[PDB]
Design a protein around this ligand. Structure first.
Ligand SMILES: O=C1CC[C@H](N2Cc3cc(C(=O)O)c(F)cc3C2=O)C(=O)N1
Ligand SMILES: [Zn+2]
Lengths: 1081, 195, 371
């Protein structure tokens, strides 16, 4: 099997943050580490510079200033033990000075995990890699190349290690535990000889749970020791110990120095509560003061002016102003900027009637939140105005430059708004008729204006304004359709049409024809000065026509089958000329046009909605297309037209604007409101943020009641009264399953409305009940759609779960009914819609219920497995069963028995975190060390083969089928969520293309620069055992063929054989290919 | 105490040989010498080369006897403590795992019986039971012929006279080998002494 | 009560032998050649002590030699229907050896011990009857903490800890990052080594008076000698590499398989879970040898239904010193099940008990529901 991967949304979680001078010794930088990514900022009163992708999970990040260098240097160590030092060049290039893989052969990693540290002198990096070995990289210019040495530790259990400021020879200091208790010890590093030499000080037993060791600058020197109850300072034979009650209720995990002096220190809480520490001055005492709640801080970084960057993995990352004068609101901290964070992606689902968007459980505890994620074009609303019934809109230029004038139409009327900055205003425009429905206006040649009404084509003056020449139907009927430019007008009347020219003080007639049937849509847009062709669409012939000017001779009559054309256009994208033809039923035929020859051909037909659609050109600086319908639609272009949805509820009409108040902008009108703003340049992902203040845990969509069912968990203390209001102590309707007849976890099925994102209903499961599964489904033959939950019963005395429930619900009118139950003798891990039957995992079993008329669950069929049926997915008759030990099991219901039957199985001991079915034969899944793998179906058939491994780098929680682009190369799709907040995708390639897109990769790696000089074919090699990936294709590489310069392309495509009925390759053949692969998210 | 008698060399007064299997044997210690009941006095021990006037078990002795019987002692007699001394007679019952045979030993068989030192001719008179050597199932019925591999308890009458022990009551003394035409044909233990 | 150390040093055999404190493992995945005696059927668990008496010369010739070198021999897991399709097996190291020419026939005793499981590649037959074995070794697959991958990089410092509330202060502090996963604290525990053993420890304490390994790999292989399972089952245990996977598919067994029926007629109860108990330190069941070259993985249970007796109490070659055996069998089908042990002294505990050989038992799950 041959697949393809790609990141839709880059990971969001913050591994680490550090202040320093790295772009410039003048400048001051925050450096953020988002797992595989590395962000650099610049401090102001932030401003970005460069974000760059490692081939590694950044495992340590530290800036440090070696002697005799212009600016601090960055050190990155990764998760496959890759090391490197970096420098910033200014065009901009981050440049690997030093590099290497410091992987030892023998060792088991430390339980405390990787602790990299540099000494304040710039002598050595200190990597407490394996248990009982302090690795040292010495900072001479001979160590350029990977070269290091270990030292022996007596001690195995090392909690925390840090170098000590203010010593004449490098000094490490660390806590360590043994059956004699936790002690803090110091060694002096003996670089020359390669060992430790008895250190200055050592204390006996510190606090029981003391886990942190700060090393304080050289006004004071020495170290601080944090724990649960006690912060304890130590230098030489000084000893400070306070046990403040103001840190009793939780733990200290992250910290940072505020001011270099080292008087002030940030201290964050496992439950957010940001604290400051004080060192009173030499050293005398300590003080801690509440600062306030932060987002649950993973790491902390004080810039200046009392502002702090709080990084977090759970929730949104912040920038927090902290005054010295506390408000009576509460305390001393104020939120300035919310950095979105799809923090722990735990479940997700796909929604909506086309394309589709994405909704996630996201974050945890107080940060916990749904996220709505949608793939379209944004618009920054400058001006909204309650103004109804706008049936036409045009801009105007009242003085020759910059528009200043908006003309509006309503049934049998017109009006005019004059623009003066950020203030729209009524106006009259002499020589315009304010009491007939305008069909077109705008500027024209010879310094003039042209209104066009149902009645009159009215050429006007710009210098003292006034009608100068008017056109009318010879017999004096109504104009039905009207299409103009700078010069030529072509108005229609029912079943025949006219051709005007603009002169000064004179419109002038020319060509009067007679058509087959009554016309509906016209366009004349030009491709030199004046347009010698014309677009037509007929009412009965339902036919897009292209006509010659003066003559009105035919040339191609591509007859679409049918409903009536609703607009038509000729515009240009990049450097090829097209004709579009938007219909009422809302389709959009889009053709390839020949100015010179006149021919159409190479048709494509797409649909944009069941609303009639309105085609409008515009600039923002290439020539786009704004279509109007139910689903707004911008079109552009790289030589394949790209239809992208727009983030707004229907737009009926729009126009370009370019005023002295709203430049390069866009005025747009829905049934009720006029909107003027500026559009963004290319479609991104946009994210809607739904604060819960409790942890979500599952999600699903009941279409037929436009609502989300969501399982969730708050936290409460014992008498059971909570901490805060959450999304389960404040719903409209609020139910329960039982009455009043240290922490504790309360489970709730929430109900949520897919428009409002309020909490309609918040059911509350039993005491000591655990909500495992959730699902929305129709069952048996019955038109009701229920919200089924499965539970398990969690007593702490009992080590397995002995009982649980499969609780059907229903959502009807304004209430949440408790329909049925089934008590079950264990745990309902997973349930799933299967052939109109409920199919559930319970402990070690797969049970199949039918839904009887009486409105209950009867057990059709039973099947016991060996694996704890934790995972379950299905397609057709087939069932896939997973356990946390990567043991996989394919089952098939066979109707003609009424029994399950084992088709296939595979058991290779490893941790699993989800699985999926891609098709009948193959099975995606995320085994240990942030990996992917795929098994394949095809006596000895009951063995699922290994046919693909890859090193993802992200902790997958959930796979679900779906896309983030319209309906419509690839086969299939599979999104995936992630702990790092990343969202990815998967899809099978055909064989032909796997070939090239592997061949391709090799090539690009030679040319492409790796952040730390880490080879691509290692990074994406599977890890624990270790092998190089097969059966996958890092798209996130393929794509990066477009961000390289034109020489380097040629380089890449040097010697290939491109597949079409087959010859030497160009860059322009792969450009094509790689773009056809940026269009699956 | 006990001492098998391997051979009697006629020097000074009289001597003998054998591995001292039970009980320490003092200088001038009054002992008995069996299948004839005879009194004797210890004169000279010649343990291996050396002479230690005492000598404990597991040591090779050349004992210099003084009694009535000076020669007319054979290999297949022993030396005994006069209190709880040695059984003898000429009938006994024995578990007998048969080890080599081309067909079927079958009641009224004629073989030699190598006991400790004694070498005398013997007949298995009748066989009692068989054994499923898996478990030690004491056979339900009476066998009528035992084969190779196969275990059987059975009753032997040596045509002359022995001086047995029961295995358990005594190990080394009980263990014995039937031996036809040279090939060991069974090894056996002796359970019970019939009159 | 007697001493729980005497049975496991197999004092029935022969006073003192010539021990070998020596080591000799083969680094993992290694493609070695090993020899396998004829006759010895049995699936041999590591850690488990296998005594043996070997009669024929071909056997002795093989043994007497394997004393100068490895002292390790192989033992082939047979499923009977395989038919020379012995696919797995175990390395049995001779930690003891005495031979004696003084009976009037060549005899050998040993005491082996399993060392490494392994895969059979090819089996080659020297015409002496003994086999040699082309054999890949199996390693031990040992997964790191579930919560490794997903641990929080500031909550690494309190991954380490210095009556059963301690377990509620273990799970909440160990699997805290469960939240980050698709699953809760209490699930990750059902797959957590430390916890698993401790649940098995409770199931060996009802067997009474216990000490034993810290490394689960060894804990797994240990407890597997105590489980009185049939042939084909015993295997799945061996094959299952992971300790976790093993520890689990042990606890599924202790808990479910309550009834030990007779393996001939199939539905004839003989004893229950309740009535097993540790006599030996190695547990209730261990492997003892009889005086003809047979083995009896045999179980120490207080009482037992549906047994005759035959013969009378004998203390010949009693594995248990101071007890005395009488042959037992099925009332129904008459086939052998074990031996009834009777005391001699009147100041010993289990005044009576039943030793039952494994080759005669069949663990069953009650009811006809889940069965
Ligand atoms: O503690 C024990 C239990 C009994 C078991 N026994 C004794 C035994 C004797 C004989 C024999 O014929 O002497 C035999 F053939 C088989 C066995 C047998 O299985 C044992 O080994 N010791
Ligand atoms: Zn039976």
């Amino acid at each position: 099997s041959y697949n393809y991967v790609v990141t839709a949304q880059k990971p969001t979680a913050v591994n680490g943050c550090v202040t320093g001078h790295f772009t410039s010794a003048e400048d001051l930088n925050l450096l953020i580490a988002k797992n595989t990514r590395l962000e650099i900022y610049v401090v102001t009163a932030l401003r970005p510079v460069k974000e760059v992708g490692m081939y590694g999970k950044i495992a340590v990040m530290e800036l440090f200033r070696p002697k005799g260098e212009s600016k601090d240097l960055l050190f990155i160590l990764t998760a496959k033990y890759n090391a490197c030092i970096l420098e910033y060049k200014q065009s901009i290039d981050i440049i690997t000075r030093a590099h290497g893989n410091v992987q030892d052969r023998i060792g088991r990693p430390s339980e405390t995990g990787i602790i990299g540290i540099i000494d304040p002198e710039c002598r050595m990096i200190g990597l407490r890699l394996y248990d009982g070995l302090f690795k040292v990289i010495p900072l001479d210019r001979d160590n350029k190349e990977l070269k290091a040495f270990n030292i022996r530790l007596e001690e195995l259990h090392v909690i925390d290690v840090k170098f000590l400021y203010g010593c004449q020879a490098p000094t490490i200091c660390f806590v360590y535990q043994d059956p004699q208790g936790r002690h803090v010890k110091t060694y002096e590093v003996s670089l020359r000889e390669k060992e430790f030499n008895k250190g200055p000080w050592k204390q006996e037993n510190v606090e029981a749970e003391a886990s942190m060791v700060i090393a304080v600058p050289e006004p004071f020197g020495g170290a601080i020791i944090i724990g649960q109850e006690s912060i304890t300072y130590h230098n030489g034979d000084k000893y400070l110990a306070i046990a403040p009650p103001i840190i009793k209720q939780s733990t200290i995990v992250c910290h940072n120095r505020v001011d270099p002096n080292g008087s002030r220190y940030l201290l964050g809480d496992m439950e957010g509560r940001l604290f400051m520490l004080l060192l009173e001055k030499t050293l005398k005492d300590l003080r801690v003061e509440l600062l306030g709640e932060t987002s649950i801080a993973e790491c902390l970084t004080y810039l200046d002016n009392g502002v702090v960057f709080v990084g977090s993995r759970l929730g949104d990352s912040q920038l927090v102003k902290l005054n010295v004068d506390s408000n009576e609101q509460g305390s001393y901290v104020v939120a300035m900027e919310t950095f979105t964070n799809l923090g722990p992606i735990v479940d997700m689902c796909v929604v909506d009637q086309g394309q589709g968007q994405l909704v996630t459980c996201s974050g945890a505890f107080k940060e916990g939140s749904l996220r709505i994620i949608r793939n379209g074009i944004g618009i920054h609303e400058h001006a909204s105005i309650d103004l109804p019934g706008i049936k036409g809109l045009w801009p105007l230029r009242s003085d020759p430059e910059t528009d200043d004038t908006l003309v509006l139409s309503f049934v049998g009327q017109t009006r005019v708004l004059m623009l003066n900055g950020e203030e729209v205003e009524e106006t009259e425009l002499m020589g315009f008729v304010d009491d007939q429905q305008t069909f077109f206006c705008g500027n024209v040649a010879h310094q003039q204006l042209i209104q066009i009404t149902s009645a009159s084509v009215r050429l006007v003056s710009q210098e003292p304004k006034a009608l100068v020449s008017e056109w009318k139907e010879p017999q004096a009927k109504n104009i039905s359709v009207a299409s103009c430019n700078s010069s030529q007008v072509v108005v229609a009347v029912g079943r025949a049409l006219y051709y005007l020219q603009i002169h000064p003080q004179e419109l002038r007639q020319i060509s009067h024809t007679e058509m087959e049937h009554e016309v509906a849509c016209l366009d004349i847009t030009p491709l030199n000065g004046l347009s010698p062709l014309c677009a037509i669409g007929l009412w009965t012939d339902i036919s897009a026509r292209i006509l010659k000017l003066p003559s009105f001779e035919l040339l191609h009559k591509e007859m679409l089958g049918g409903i009536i054309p609703r607009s038509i256009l000729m515009t240009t994208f990049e450097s090829s000329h097209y004709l579009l033809c938007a219909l009422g039923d809302g389709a959009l035929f889009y053709f390839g046009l020949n100015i010179e020859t006149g021919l159409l051909s190479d048709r494509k037909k797409v649909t944009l909605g069941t609303q009639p659609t309105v085609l409008r050109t515009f600039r923002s600086s290439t020539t786009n297309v704004f279509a109007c319908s139910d689903r707004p639609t911008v079109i552009y272009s790289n030589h394949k037209l790209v239809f992208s949805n727009v983030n707004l509820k229907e737009v009926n009409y729009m126009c370009p604007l370019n005023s002295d108040g709203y430049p390069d902008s866009l005025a747009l009108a829905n049934n009720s409101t006029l909107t003027i703003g500026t559009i963004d340049e290319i479609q991104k992902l946009h994210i809607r943020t739904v604060p819960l203040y409790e942890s979500p845990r599952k999600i699903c969509y009941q279409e037929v009641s436009q609502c989300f069912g969501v399982l969730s968990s708050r936290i409460e203390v014992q008498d059971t009264t909570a901490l805060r209001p959450s999304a389960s102590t404040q719903a409209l309707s609020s139910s329960v399953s039982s009455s009043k007849l240290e922490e504790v976890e309360v489970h709730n099925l929430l109900i949520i409305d897919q428009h409002t994102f309020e909490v309609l209903h918040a059911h509350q499961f039993l005491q000591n009940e655990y909500a495992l599964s959730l699902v929305s489904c129709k069952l048996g033959k019955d038109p009701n759609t229920y919200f089924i939950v499965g539970t398990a019963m969690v007593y702490p005395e009992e080590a397995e779960p002995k009982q649980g429930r499969i609780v059907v619900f229903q959502y009807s009118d304004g209430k949440l009914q408790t329909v049925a139950e089934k008590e079950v003798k264990g745990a309902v891990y997973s349930m799933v819609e299967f052939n109109g039957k409920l199919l559930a995992s319970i402990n070690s079993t797969v049970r199949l219920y039918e839904w009887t008329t009486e409105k209950e669950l009867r057990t059709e069929c039973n099947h016991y497995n060996n694996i704890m049926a934790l995972y379950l997915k299905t397609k057709g008759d087939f069932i896939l069963v997973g356990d946390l030990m990567r043991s996989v099991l394919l089952l098939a219901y066979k109707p003609m028995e009424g029994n399950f039957e084992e088709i296939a199985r595979d058991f290779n001991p490893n941790w699993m975190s989800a699985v999926e079915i891609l098709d009948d034969d193959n099975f995606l899944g995320a085994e240990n060390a942030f990996n992917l793998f795929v098994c394949q179906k095809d006596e000895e058939r009951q063995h699922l083969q290994e046919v693909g491994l890859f090193h993802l780098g992200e902790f997958v929680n959930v796979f679900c089928h779906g896309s983030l682009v319209m309906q419509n190369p690839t086969q299939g799709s599979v999104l995936f969520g992630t702990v790092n907040g990343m969202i990815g995708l998967v899809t099978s390639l055909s064989e032909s293309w796997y070939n090239l897109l592997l061949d391709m990769q090799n090539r690009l790696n030679k040319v492409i620069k790796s952040v730390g000089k880490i080879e691509h074919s290692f990074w994406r090699s599977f890890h624990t055992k270790t092998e190089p990936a097969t059966g996958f294709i890092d798209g996130d590489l393929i794509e990066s063929f477009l961000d390289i310069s034109r020489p380097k392309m040629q380089e890449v495509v040097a010697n290939l054989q491109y597949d079409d009925g087959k010859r030497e390759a160009t860059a322009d053949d792969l450009i094509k290919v790689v773009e056809e692969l940026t269009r699956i998210h | 105490i006990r001492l098998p008698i391997v051979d009697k060399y006629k020097d000074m007064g009289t001597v003998v040989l054998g591995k001292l299997e039970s009980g320490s044997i003092c200088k001038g210690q009054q002992l008995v010498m069996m299948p004839n009941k005879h009194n004797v006095e210890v004169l000279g021990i010649l343990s291996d080369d050396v002479e230690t006037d005492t000598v404990a078990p597991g040591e090779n002795l050349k004992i210099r006897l003084k009694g009535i019987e000076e020669e007319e002692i054979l290999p297949g007699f022993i030396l005994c403590d006069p209190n709880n001394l040695c059984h003898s007679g000429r009938t006994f019952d024995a578990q007998i795992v048969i080890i080599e045979h081309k067909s079927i030993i079958c009641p009224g068989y004629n073989a030699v019986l190598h006991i400790h030192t004694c070498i005398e001719e013997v007949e298995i008179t009748a066989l009692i039971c068989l054994v499923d050597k898996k478990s030690g199932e004491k056979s339900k019925t009476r066998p009528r012929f035992v084969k190779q591999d196969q275990v059987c308890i059975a009753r032997l009458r040596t045509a002359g006279t022995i001086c047995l022990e029961t295995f358990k009551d005594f190990p080394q003394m009980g263990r014995f080998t039937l031996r036809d035409e040279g090939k060991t044909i069974a090894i056996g233990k002796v359970l019970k002494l019939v009159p | 009560n007697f001493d729980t150390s005497l049975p496991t040093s197999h004092t029935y055999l022969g006073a003192d032998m010539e021990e070998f404190h020596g080591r000799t493992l083969h680094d993992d995945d290694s493609c070695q050649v090993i020899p396998v005696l004829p006759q010895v059927m049995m699936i041999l668990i590591p850690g488990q002590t296998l005594p043996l008496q070997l009669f024929h010369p071909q056997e002795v010739s093989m043994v007497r030699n394997l004393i100068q070198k490895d002292r390790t021999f192989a033992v082939l897991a047979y499923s009977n229907v395989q038919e020379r399709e012995a696919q797995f097996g175990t390395t049995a190291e001779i930690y003891a050896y005495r031979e004696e020419q003084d009976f009037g026939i060549e005899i050998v005793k040993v005491k082996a011990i399993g060392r490494q499981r392994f895969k059979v590649l090819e089996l080659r037959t020297q015409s002496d009857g003994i086999q040699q074995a082309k054999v890949q070794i199996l390693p031990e697959c040992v997964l790191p903490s579930t919560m490794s991958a997903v641990q929080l990089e500031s909550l690494n410092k309190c991954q380490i800890f210095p009556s059963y509330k301690w377990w509620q202060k273990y799970q909440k502090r160990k699997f805290h990052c469960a939240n980050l996963t698709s699953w809760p604290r209490w699930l990750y525990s059902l797959y957590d080594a430390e916890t698993l053993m401790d649940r098995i420890k409770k199931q060996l304490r009802e067997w009474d008076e216990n000490s034993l390994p810290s490394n689960p790999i060894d804990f797994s292989y240990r407890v597997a000698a105590c489980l009185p399972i049939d042939d084909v089952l015993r295997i799945q245990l061996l094959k299952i590499g992971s300790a976790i996977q093993r520890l689990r598919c042990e606890l599924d067994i202790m808990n479910k398989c309550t009834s030990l029926c007779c393996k001939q007629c199939q539905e004839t109860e003989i004893t229950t879970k309740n009535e097993i108990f540790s006599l030996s330190l190695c547990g209730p069941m261990a492997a003892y040898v009889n005086p003809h070259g047979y083995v009896h993985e045999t179980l120490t249970v207080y009482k037992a239904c549906n047994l005759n007796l035959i013969g009378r109490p004998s203390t010949e070659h009693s594995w248990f010193p101071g007890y005395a055996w009488t042959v037992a069998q099925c009332k129904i089908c008459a086939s052998h099940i074990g031996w009834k042990f009777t005391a001699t002294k009147k100041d010993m505990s289990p005044q009576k008990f039943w030793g039952l050989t494994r080759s005669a038992l069949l663990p069953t799950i009650p009811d006809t529901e889940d069965e």
